[PDB]
Design a protein around this ligand. Structure first.
Ligand SMILES: [C][N][C][C][C][N][C][C][C][N][C][C][C]([O])N1=C2C(=O)[N]C(=O)N=C2N([C][C]([O])[C]([O])[C]([O])[C]OP([O])(=O)OP([O])(=O)O[C][C]2O[C](N3[C]=NC4=C3N=[C]N=C4[N])[C]([O])[C]2[O])C2=[C]C([C])=C([C])[C]=C21
Ligand SMILES: [C][N][C][C][C][N][C][C][C][N][C][C][C]([O])N1=C2C(=O)[N]C(=O)N=C2N([C][C]([O])[C]([O])[C]([O])[C]OP([O])(=O)OP([O])(=O)O[C][C]2O[C](N3[C]=NC4=C3N=[C]N=C4[N])[C]([O])[C]2[O])C2=[C]C([C])=C([C])[C]=C21
Ligand SMILES: *[C@@H]1O[C@H](CO)[C@@H](O[C@@H]2O[C@H](CO)[C@@H](O)[C@H](O)[C@H]2NC(C)=O)[C@H](O)[C@H]1NC(C)=O
Ligand SMILES: *[C@@H]1O[C@H](CO)[C@@H](O[C@@H]2O[C@H](CO)[C@@H](O)[C@H](O)[C@H]2NC(C)=O)[C@H](O)[C@H]1NC(C)=O
Lengths: 462, 459
């Protein structure tokens, strides 16, 4: 059987790998960009390679082994460090300079955590159809008995840190049932390890790809003609007998099946035309799920003016404006002596910021920093990097988030195949949507469904 | 039967009236503030009375008569004017100076309208159970084929004016099925009339109360001992046989039933303790619904510097920060010669602003106006009025809003009594939650439900 796989991110390379394993080697992987890895991709910033996209292996040291861990931590030995969030209470800055009293902050954190735990108990009891779901915010109101969730500067940045920094949209839009507790953590462990290796987290993808695609003996570059980069799929025609795939440069290919790995945001943007048009139930499923955006803004300074030391890696800015340049990370371990800082924003701020100049964003950040370190002579950043994933047509966002409103059956419709057209990608991960491991696993799962149809003549979906 | 009514806002006065009409006159209305009317309430600003709460009779000129209209337009003849939003396209200001090209804006408005219309068609097809409901944002994504809804400053402000200015929360939190289209307009008509009468929109409530509560023949003030102001209820105990209600000043009252009309926000806050505790099903429905906040910031200036004239009443500021001081109104017709402007914000901005000083808010607003009217010498406002409804423990918000996730059945649980504890108010209105007419009809309905149970034993 010949199979075309659209996209060479983690799930597409992962799917083709699984297919190869089942003996389906008549493969054609069409990648829009000039490289593989997709949302796992590094870039040079001021002399160091930093990750534009995924940066952590999330879910480690738990009851089951996150499949991404061994590859990262053993097979490849990518440099990495366990993130420690235990000292946040000593690191929350007031909108107007200096940090808040630690004990005061630890209490607010402890309360936030208790509400969330109460939320996990409620979640376990909800009807599996998702029909009784509610937003994380509704759960907060219920447990705090207030007509609003966190609303003071400190409780709001603690909330953002707890939720938006993980999911990229606010608790009020997010499905409780599908995120609290989060399977990634329940199954794989509460820890997270930040990859900071010149080779990039994407090395995991090149590794997997190398397990079945031919590579150059001296350079090790993949040279297998089954991988074709710079090939943007623009149309997929499918029928009872097969599928035809056309790229922007006018190439046309034929296969027995096609496996689509492009992000949810790509699917929501109509970059790829389906012929015939996808069924309405499929279309609605696509639009109802959320494609979030998480912007890692890197900054480079001529000198250091923030604290370093035990518990200093992560720090928060308690703005009275929710989500305004709130979550900071300093790199004493990852990029020692580089004088870089990373402030993370998402959702509304991400969209605003992608639409204006980096110079304007830098100036906004400089006022924040000077307000945070009033006693320091804070020098202007000499370099800034604003990743624009939402504006990039091959991504249209950073990762999916399960919103209140999408039920179990609707999520299955999002994953479901349409004729000979199969879907894969993090947004099709049953329990790990939004993650690298979810992409990896979704690739295997989608391939297996295809293998069943193709090899075992089992073509019915659910 | 003796019945205690908590709250003398529109629904409380409405329910007591309906009860009285059924002959249930042994009533005791306990109101927290020193006056009746609740969310319909005026105040003096700049030597003139403006509305801190509701200001429009919404849904007029349609297939059915909005019950409030005749009271306002005929019985009391409160002074009022139909709002015309037809010229918005000429009045959308750029973040940094002047208005946008009118044709460009009109087309953005049209796309927005068209998307909503398609949303209306879609909404009609969803199932009653609510199983296929989605947020308005999800509908916009689906109808426009994008991974996001309106996202440029202009599109965002148009979006904010069309939804948030009506519902006070963003489309992404809002239930499509239960707000688009909206019954209020579908039933009563598309127009809205702005009440600007010194007696206040609250006069409607006073008129209704005077139809059954005693009033002094000279003053006209209510003097019926059945109405007690400054009574903050803090505890309601109930048993299969009756109820006891305790107020903050330590008074204790007994009755056969209690009709609770305090806002959903008050109920989500714990100001009132129920004993025993309300059952889980009740509690979940309470916290799952939204109590929104809409803040009307009035400003007075030493002289006018904004345009007046045809289509000038309403204008938008397209900030790159969604919802930042975005919807403006000038009162050339309402308060001629007053030099007052009204800017409205909601939700996140409302909670942030209520938490800072008026001076700080004024200074933020002066920066926006100056950016809007770079050609003028804009004088600093002389006075500002920032209503703090969310902070007020007797309201904790301004009006409910229906969130994606809650279906009709769960919404109806809000209306459901618990034993002898009955509920009423805008958040219990079957199809008009969030409005003055919804509070009004809600009082009648809730009263009728208690009447059939209490008087005919049909519960
Ligand atoms: C408990 N406590 C704890 C605390 C913690 N906190 C922390 C923070 C975290 N945050 C969140 C997350 C983030 O960070 N990130 C990440 C990480 O880190 N980790 C993980 O895991 N993850 C993540 N992410 C996500 C990821 O990356 C994803 O999921 C993946 O990667 C995906 O994959 P897939 O599915 O495969 O997809 P992609 O890559 O996209 O691929 C696809 C492909 O395809 C292509 N195309 C398109 N279109 C087309 C094509 N071809 C052809 N044709 C056509 N038409 C493209 O190109 C590609 O290649 C993340 C992400 C991101 C972005 C960020 C920024 C971040 C993150
Ligand atoms: C087609 N086209 C369209 C266009 C249009 N646009 C325009 C805009 C609109 N916006 C939205 C709305 C607003 O404006 N507002 C209003 C108006 O205007 N109108 C209407 O209708 N409405 C409105 N609102 C709402 C109303 O006001 C409400 O709903 C009512 O009033 C409610 O009533 P109820 O339910 O009865 O409640 P209240 O009043 O609250 O009452 C209660 C009572 O109780 C008491 N308490 C409490 N707690 C307690 C007590 N007692 C004893 N104890 C205890 N514990 C209180 O005090 C009271 O009295 C509105 C509103 C507002 C606020 C605003 C600001 C606005 C509005
Ligand atoms: C990540 O990988 C390192 C690499 O081995 C692990 O550290 C080794 O663990 C074995 C187990 O006892 C030791 O014998 C080695 O001495 C350890 N190596 C070093 C350099 O200390 C480490 O435990 C791994 N971390 C996780 C979370 O799996
Ligand atoms: C609101 O009330 C005013 C008060 O009457 C209405 O205006 C009158 O309508 C009658 C009906 O024929 C006329 O004969 C009067 O001459 C009108 N009065 C004035 C002052 O014009 C008005 O139409 C009402 N509006 C609505 C929407 O009901």
């Amino acid at each position: 059987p010949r199979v075309i796989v659209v996209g060479a991110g983690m799930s597409g390379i992962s799917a083709a790998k699984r297919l190869s394993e089942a003996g389906i080697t008549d493969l054609l992987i069409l990648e829009a960009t000039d490289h593989i890895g997709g949302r796992m991709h590094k870039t040079n910033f001021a002399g160091i390679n930093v990750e534009l996209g995924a940066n952590w292996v999330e879910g480690v040291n738990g009851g089951k082994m996150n499949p991404i861990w061994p590859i990262v931590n053993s097979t490849l030995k990518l440099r990495n460090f366990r993130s420690d969030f235990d000292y946040l209470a000593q690191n929350v800055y007031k909108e107007d300079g200096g940090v808040y009293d630690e004990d005061y902050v630890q209490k607010r954190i402890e309360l936030a955590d208790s509400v969330e735990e109460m939320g996990e108990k409620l979640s376990a009891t909800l009807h599996a159809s998702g029909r009784d779901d509610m937003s994380i915010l509704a759960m907060q109101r219920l447990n705090e008995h207030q007509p609003n969730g966190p609303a003071t500067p400190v409780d709001m940045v603690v909330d953002y840190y707890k939720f938006d920094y993980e999911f990229a949209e606010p608790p009020r839009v997010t499905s409780l049932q599908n995120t609290v507790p989060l399977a990634t953590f329940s199954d794989f462990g509460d820890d997270v390890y930040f990859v900071a290796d010149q080779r990039g987290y994407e090395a995991v993808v090149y590794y997997l790809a190398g397990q079945y695609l031919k590579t150059d003996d001296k350079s090790g570059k993949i040279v297998d003609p089954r991988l074709q980069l710079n090939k943007v799929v623009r149309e997929i025609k499918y029928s009872p007998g097969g599928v035809t795939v056309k790229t922007e440069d006018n190439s046309v290919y034929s296969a027995d099946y096609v496996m689509v790995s492009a992000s949810l945001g790509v699917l929501q943007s109509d970059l790829i035309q389906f012929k015939p048009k996808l069924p309405t139930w499929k279309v609605r499923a696509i639009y109802q799920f959320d494609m979030a955006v998480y912007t890692k803004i890197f900054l480079k300074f001529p000198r250091k003016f923030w604290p370093e030391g035990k518990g200093r890696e992560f720090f928060l800015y308690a703005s009275s404006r929710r989500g305004y340049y709130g979550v900071w990370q300093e790199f004493e371990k990852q990029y020692p002596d580089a004088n870089v800082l990373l402030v993370t924003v998402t959702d509304e701020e991400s969209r605003r910021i992608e639409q204006q100049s980096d110079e304007q964003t830098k100036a906004e950040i400089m006022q924040v920093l000077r307000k945070m370190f009033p006693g320091k002579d804070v020098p202007d950043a000499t370099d800034i990097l604003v990743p624009r994933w939402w504006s990039d047509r091959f991504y249209k966002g950073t990762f999916s988030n399960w919103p209140v409103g999408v039920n179990r059956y609707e999520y299955d419709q999002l994953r479901a195949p349409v004729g000979r057209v199969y879907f894969t990608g993090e947004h099709t991960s049953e329990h790990y949507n939004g993650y690298v491991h979810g992409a990896y696993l979704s690739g295997i799962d989608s391939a297996e469904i295809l293998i069943n149809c193709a090899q075992k003549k089992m073509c019915k979906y659910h």
